[PDB]
Amino acid sequence: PLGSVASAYAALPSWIAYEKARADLEEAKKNDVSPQLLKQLTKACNIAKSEFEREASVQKKLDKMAEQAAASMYKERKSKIVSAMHSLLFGMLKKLDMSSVNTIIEQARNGVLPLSIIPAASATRLIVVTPNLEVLSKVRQENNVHYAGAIWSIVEVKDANGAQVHLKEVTAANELNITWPLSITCERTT
Amino acid sequence: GSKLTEMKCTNVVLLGLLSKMHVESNSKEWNYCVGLHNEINLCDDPDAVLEKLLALIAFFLSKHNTCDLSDLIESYFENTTI
Amino acid sequence: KLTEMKCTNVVLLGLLSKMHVESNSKEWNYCVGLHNEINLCDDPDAVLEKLLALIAFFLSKHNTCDLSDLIESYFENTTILQ
């Protein structure tokens, strides 16, 4: 019955309605039921038949549309497409004119940006890069870092050589002696 | 505040950019990105949207060489043609 | 009756299929409506607003849907986004 159709699973709801209507009419004929009940059952069958045919053509339209769509995509971004999105993105960020957006962008321009932004752990983990003593002073507020509108508690601080660094020890007189930039490992105060 | 759709449209461009940066290779990182983007689009509190947008921008910022990023900001943010 | 896309966006067709949008004519025509309006827009801001509406629709059906390919395809097919 549904052996020639493309998808018997897709065709099933409309086919059952038609088959059930066809079966009622066949039982009505065999049981020689009233001409009135026969006229009702014939109409129900005509309705279900035309619904089955309507859904069958809709299915053919959707399959053809997808077949054509797949045939045209198969053709397949640009440094240009990425460049167009970069232009849009930075243009919109400036147009927003929000101090926290301006802060994050100015920090990145001066090398204050994340090395890593690791989620989950029920507490987001940020490794921030601080290229000098002045910029480090702006972001670090004691045992906390103020970045991306949030406050992060300091876990660890490292040299550009990966060596452990004590923040108390990073001072004006020491700046020449420290291998910059510093990596501040911190966790979101959540 | 009134710039809620502006922040939501920025978020869409960010996710599009992140997708082109092959973050998909890292499932944990990808779900964090997609998560933030989807949450932004379903949120009507501007304060909460900005917080999440700031998290997405930061993630985006991390996926760049410091040197190229400075040039990108100078070109497209500092000297925008919009 | 279901409306056709002027310039079929393959990825859009894929989401309509994945989320069985054909079942609801009102929903399909809203989606195809947004797509056709995107192709006639003179403004990137207006295009993004329409893309944000398509995203809002798919996220209303699946809160965690990864729609990054939809965003990519629009940047790749719409001259205004270039």
Curated annotation (Swiss-Prot), chain A:
Subcellular location: Host cytoplasm, Host perinuclear region
Limits of the RdRp Nsp8 cofactor domain: 4-190
Highest taxon listed in the record's lineage: Viruses
Name of the protein: Non-structural protein 8
Full protein stretch here: 3583 to 3774 of 6709
